[PDB]
Amino acid sequence: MNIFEMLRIDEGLRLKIYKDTEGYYTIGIGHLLTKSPSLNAAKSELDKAIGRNTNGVITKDEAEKLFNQDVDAAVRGILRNAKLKPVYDSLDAVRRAALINMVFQMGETGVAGFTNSLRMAQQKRWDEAAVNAAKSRWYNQTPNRAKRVITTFRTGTWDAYK
Numbered sequence: 001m002n003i004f005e006m007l008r009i010d011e012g013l014r015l016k017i018y019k020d021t022e023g024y025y026t027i028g029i030g031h032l033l034t035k036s037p038s039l040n041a042a043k044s045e046l047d048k049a050i051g052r053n054t055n056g057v058i059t060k061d062e063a064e065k066l067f068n069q070d071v072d073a074a075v076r077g078i079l080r081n082a083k084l085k086p087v088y089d090s091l092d093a094v095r096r097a098a099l100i101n102m103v104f105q106m107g108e109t110g111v112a113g114f115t116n117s118l119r120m121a122q123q124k125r126w127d128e129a130a131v132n133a134a135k136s137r138w139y140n141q142t143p144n145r146a147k148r149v150i151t152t153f154r155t156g157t158w159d160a161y162k
């Protein structure tokens, strides 16, 4: 199991523009196109992303490319984020994946707000931080996912993904 497999499991893969649980235009493996309501807006952003007139549809290949970019950017974001970096560097590799998962899903910012869990996580207090992260709009909105991620973080194993 690795970050790619894990997120491919959490985000799925759609070749057509779709709405996320939030109602936002998205495509591929969790690639947010836009927050705007304009589906037209969404196609433009999709065309710009891909480099051609997709007309709202992409190939598998294309989706995997956006995905590759998205993970990479997620990683680089953490590494340049200051609340973030130190936590990440303190972690073992499974747990680092969990953090990347969160950042991909919610952005540096949203991940920034787990200050209290995250400090607990810097302190290696698996149990507490986990219960703390659970009290979040994130968990209440996508509980199954959240649960897999918090288990991975707490445990340092991929059990939740088996």
Ligand SMILES: [Ar]
Binding pocket: 114, 117, 118, 121, 129, 133
């Ligand atoms: Ar956390």
Ligand SMILES: [Ar]
Binding pocket: 117, 121, 129, 130, 133, 149, 150, 153, 154
């Ligand atoms: Ar967590």
Ligand SMILES: [Cl-]
Binding pocket: 048, 049
């Ligand atoms: Cl892009």
Ligand SMILES: [Cl-]
Binding pocket: 142, 143, 144, 145, 146
């Ligand atoms: Cl979920």
